[PDB]
């Protein structure tokens, strides 16, 4: 795990907390710019390529049949296998939460310039309320595909929300949401095991199971050291969801997850306490029926990272994380690093 400083181009300002990175065939792309898209890049999506520790953000264009989604902070993002990306929830530049779901897919790749398709998927049934800071993952059970969505936050409901606390947020009800992309329906399951609301947790999905790690529960204000397994069965009848608590769970909120090899992932970053960053890193080894969380060697953090109050980042995909910490102000607002594995 080698840490590396990164320089940024003229449009460094776009990069903010809550941004997202998507991987299409090794080419990384960037989404969720600060402010609304400007005439320099109307889509708000950028080809994000670091060459010799210098990052250039270059505008990407959309297909004629694309939606022009708003920039979204803290959406639930997922990869679908023909490779495509799911974006659900998030905050808009106007601080609204969007219930809409967008699918990002490569339309054309002529001469190493990529056109994207951004289509909106309508959702009926038990649609999850607008959310940020929540996870969405795709499971495979008995030759069937199903989407799972758990946790997060939203504003108070229209009946109780008052302008004096207009921005107050509360954890969504911790209902697991099965979401079939083929039909556009969503099914809600209440479980006894998932009693508290949870946001900014990590989600790792293998076959028919999704693990829920860390996170923060607003009511309790606790970053619980619990691990939750959620198994989904896809028989010919209505699917069934079973949850199991498994002790030995990490205590971290807003952690970042990257895949080093098949069936092994690294969990870095995030916070153990409001004022205490989580400097340690954990290695997760998956078994068809078992999950293994191991302490691993901490990286050689610089004195900036050690003493920053906040840090943010996302996974670039090839087992390399892109990190950002608040920088000096007159200069550039943020300082960026790339940690490889």
């Amino acid at each position: 795990v080698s840490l590396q400083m990164v320089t940024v181009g003229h449009n460094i300002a776009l990069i903010q907390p809550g941004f997202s990175l998507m991987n299409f065939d090794g080419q990384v792309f960037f989404f969720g710019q600060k402010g609304w898209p400007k005439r320099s890049c109307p889509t708000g999506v950028f080809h994000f390529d670091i060459k010799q520790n210098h990052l250039k953000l270059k505008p990407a264009i959309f297909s004629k049949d694309s939606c022009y989604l708003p920039p979204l902070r803290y959406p639930a993002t997922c990869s679908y296998k023909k490779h495509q990306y799911i974006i659900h929830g998030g905050k808009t530049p106007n601080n609204e939460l969007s219930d809409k779901i967008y699918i990002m897919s490569v339309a054309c790749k002529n001469n190493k310039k990529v056109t994207f398709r951004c289509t909106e998927k309508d959702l009926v049934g038990d649609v999850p309320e607008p959310r940020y800071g929540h996870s969405i993952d795709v499971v495979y059970s008995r030759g069937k595909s199903m989407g799972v969505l758990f946790g997060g936050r939203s504003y108070m409901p229209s009946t109780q929300r008052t302008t004096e606390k207009w921005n107050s947020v509360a954890d969504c009800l911790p209902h697991v949401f099965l979401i079939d992309f083929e039909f556009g329906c969503a099914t809600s399951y209440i479980l006894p095991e998932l009693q508290d609301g949870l946001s900014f947790h990590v989600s790792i999905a293998r076959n028919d199971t999704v693990y829920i790690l860390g996170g923060h529960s607003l009511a309790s204000n606790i970053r619980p050291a619990n691990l939750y397994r959620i198994r989904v069965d896809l028989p010919l009848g209505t699917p069934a969801v079973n949850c199991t608590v498994l002790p030995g769970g990490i205590s971290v909120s807003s952690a970042i997850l990257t895949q080093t090899n098949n069936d092994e992932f690294v969990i870095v970053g995030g916070y153990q306490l409001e004022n205490q960053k989580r400097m340690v890193c954990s290695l997760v080894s998956l078994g068809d029926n078992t999950i293994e969380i191991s302490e691993m060697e901490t990286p050689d953090w610089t004195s900036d990272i050690k003493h920053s109050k906040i840090w943010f980042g996302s996974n670039m995909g090839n087992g390399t994380i892109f990190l950002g910490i608040p920088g000096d102000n007159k200069s550039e607002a943020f300082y960026f690093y790339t940690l490889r594995c």
Binding site: Q16, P17, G18, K34, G35, W36, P37, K38, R39, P42, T43, I61, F62, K64, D65, S66, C67, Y68, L69, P70, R73, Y74, K91, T92, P93, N94, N95, E96, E120, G133, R153, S158, R161, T162, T163, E164, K165, W166, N167, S168, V169, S199, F200, H216, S253, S254, Y271, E274, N275, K309, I310, P326, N329
Partner: protein
């Protein structure tokens, strides 16, 4: 022993010296005034004084024989504090020193002024909304509220880098009306109406919002805020009452652009260009305002409940802010108007014939068109179709023209034409940057010799005021060789000075009716002058504000009656108070500066306190 002065002697000693004149006066009293020596000496002294032009002593002695005590009511003291700009800590020094030299407590101590304040600030008077306001709390004791409005600040969330405080929109308006109460009563009286008449009043409110630069950050613990502030203010413009089938102008602001009547509603330390934080702070304000569009405020004035209906007009915005909050592109764009769909090129070819088509409603539609792309169009075609509306509006403004910013950007254009006329660009197309720099230097030196104008870095209100005269064109003409172009300049400025009073005066219909009449005629020759004798600059392009000024001024005038009174200039002049108050009238610490300024800025805008200063001039 030489006779001392009579005033030095002891009582017993001055008695001996006047006992010869004392017995002489007792006689005069019994013979003439019935032995009332007290009254005859009191009058002989008082008259002796005024004989030596010493009226003050005599007048005070009069007031002390009458014996009436002297002292200012706290609410009087508050008005003197608020309106003479004194700080409490300076006022306390005055108060203290007055009480110790006169022995009398002429001014009241601070705790009482601080009690008088309570009436004039939001949260004090009770009210109610029928129907109740949507998503608003119905508490009526809500003064200064935290401007983040419960914004989430845990370390997982988006970083909170601003401080803000505000009043709740209604509770503010209420305290606004109650300030105007005495002025509202008289407005019915001088309209020959019943004082106690309580019909459905209507309050038209001007809304204003600006961003400020160069707001120094305090040391000390707190959010690492930016060095910019944002202000949201409202002015009460007119109150009409419905008496029969007439709308009776009970009240109309005499000075619509004065710092005095602009009311502070929201102070934040934040950058207007930072959309994320701007919407976060102001969205609770726009919801409270939305709610009040569909309710009537029942409020009790002088023992009689009255009802008020509210019309909100956002017109104290500059073009850059308008374009930000209504989802339009920035102002380089080819979509140059915020009032119409015209394109920069088109505005240069047609110039005058364009009607007001944009609106907060339409943009909101167009954004949703943008985001959804229903005709599965290309992004050029999409943008054409939505005429550049490519973000989601979040504040509703009037489609209008700010006069101040209109006056400014126009003069700066003329300042440029002046330069390009010195360099004879009308004849010689190309010129080096060094050649241009000296045209500006020439003109700058000359505006100093002839017009006493020192050069300034950014264009001014007053500079524009004083540059856009015909005397200045005389000045600038001395520099240009050809008198065929002295004529073009002179006419261009004549047309502009015939037009200007329309879009700057409070009531053009009353104040320059002929200029309002001819506006469509003069604006056509101005446009044609630019199109012929100024091809070099205005072929294929025109400035945003030349378009607004040449195409939409008459329509706006007939829709609203005025442009000049809905200008942001009152808001701008309020900024001057922001700066002064933040230094000299607020606790000097990161967690108090914003509320202390908000509060004490409100008092400075209280007509009830202002009246006490005009009390001499009955």
């Amino acid at each position: 022993r030489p006779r001392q002065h009579l005033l030095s002697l002891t009582r017993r000693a001055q008695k001996h010296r006047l006992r010869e004149l004392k017995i002489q006066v007792k006689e005069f009293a019994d013979k003439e005034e019935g032995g009332d020596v007290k009254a005859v000496c009191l009058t002989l002294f008082l008259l002796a004084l005024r004989a030596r032009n010493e009226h003050r002593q005599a007048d005070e002695l009069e007031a002390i024989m009458q014996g009436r005590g002297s002292g200012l009511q706290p609410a009087v003291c508050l008005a003197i504090r608020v309106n003479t700009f004194l700080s409490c800590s300076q006022y306390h020094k005055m108060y203290r020193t007055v009480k110790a030299i006169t022995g009398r407590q002429i001014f009241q101590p601070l705790h009482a002024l601080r009690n008088a304040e309570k009436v004039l600030l939001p949260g004090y008077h009770p009210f109610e909304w029928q129907p109740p306001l949507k998503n608003v709390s119905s508490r009526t004791d809500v003064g200064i509220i935290d401007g983040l409005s419960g914004l989430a600040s845990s370390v997982d969330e988006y970083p909170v880098d601003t401080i803000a405080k505000r009043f709740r929109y209604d509770s503010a308006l209420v305290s606004a009306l109650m300030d105007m109460e005495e002025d509202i009563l008289e407005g019915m009286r001088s309209q020959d109406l019943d004082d106690y008449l309580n019909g459905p009043f209507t309050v038209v409110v001007k809304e204003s919002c600006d961003g400020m630069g160069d707001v120094s950050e305090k040391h000390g613990s707190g959010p690492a805020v930016p060095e910019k502030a944002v202000r949201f203010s409202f002015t009460v413009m007119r109150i009409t009452i419905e008496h029969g089938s007439q709308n009776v102008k009970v009240f109309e602001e005499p000075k619509p652009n004065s710092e005095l009547c602009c009311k502070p509603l929201c102070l934040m330390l934040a950058d207007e260009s930072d959309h994320e934080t701007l919407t976060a702070i102001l969205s609770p304000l726009i919801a409270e305002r939305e709610a009040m569009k569909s309710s009537e405020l029942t409020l009790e004035m002088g023992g009689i409940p009255r009802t008020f209906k509210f019309i909100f007009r956002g017109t104290g915005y500059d073009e850059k802010l308008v374009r930000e909050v209504e989802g339009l592109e920035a102002s380089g764009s080819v979509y140059i108007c915020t009032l119409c769909d015209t394109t920069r090129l088109e505005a240069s070819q047609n110039l005058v014939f364009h009607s007001i088509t944009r609106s907060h409603a339409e943009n909101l539609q167009r954004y949703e068109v943008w985001r959804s792309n229903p005709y599965h169009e290309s992004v050029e075609e999409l943008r054409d179709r939505v005429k550049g509306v490519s973000a989601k509006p979040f504040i509703e403004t009037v489609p209008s023209i700010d006069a101040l910013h209109c006056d400014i950007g126009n003069a700066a254009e003329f300042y440029k034409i002046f330069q390009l006329e010195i360099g004879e660009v009308y004849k010689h197309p190309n010129a080096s940057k060094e050649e241009r720099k000296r045209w500006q230097a020439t003109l700058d030196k000359h505006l100093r010799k002839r017009m006493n104008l020192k050069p300034i870095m950014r264009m001014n209100g007053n500079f524009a005021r004083k540059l856009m005269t015909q005397e200045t064109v005389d000045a600038v003409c001395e520099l240009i060789p050809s008198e065929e172009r002295h004529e073009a300049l002179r006419e261009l400025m004549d047309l502009y000075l015939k037009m200007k009073p329309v879009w700057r005066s409070s009531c053009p219909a009353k104040e320059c009716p002929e200029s309002l009449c001819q506006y469509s005629f003069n604006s056509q020759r101005f446009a044609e002058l630019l199109s012929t004798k100024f091809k070099y600059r205005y072929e294929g392009k025109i400035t945003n504000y030349f378009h607004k000024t040449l195409a939409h001024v008459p329509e706006i005038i007939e829709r609203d009656g005025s442009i000049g009174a809905w200008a942001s200039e009152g808001n701008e002049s309020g900024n001057k108070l922001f700066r002064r108050f933040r230094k000299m009238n607020a606790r000097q610490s990161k967690c108090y500066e914003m509320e202390d300024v908000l509060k004490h800025h409100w008092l400075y805008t209280s007509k009830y306190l202002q009246k006490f200063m005009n009390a001499h001039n009955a």
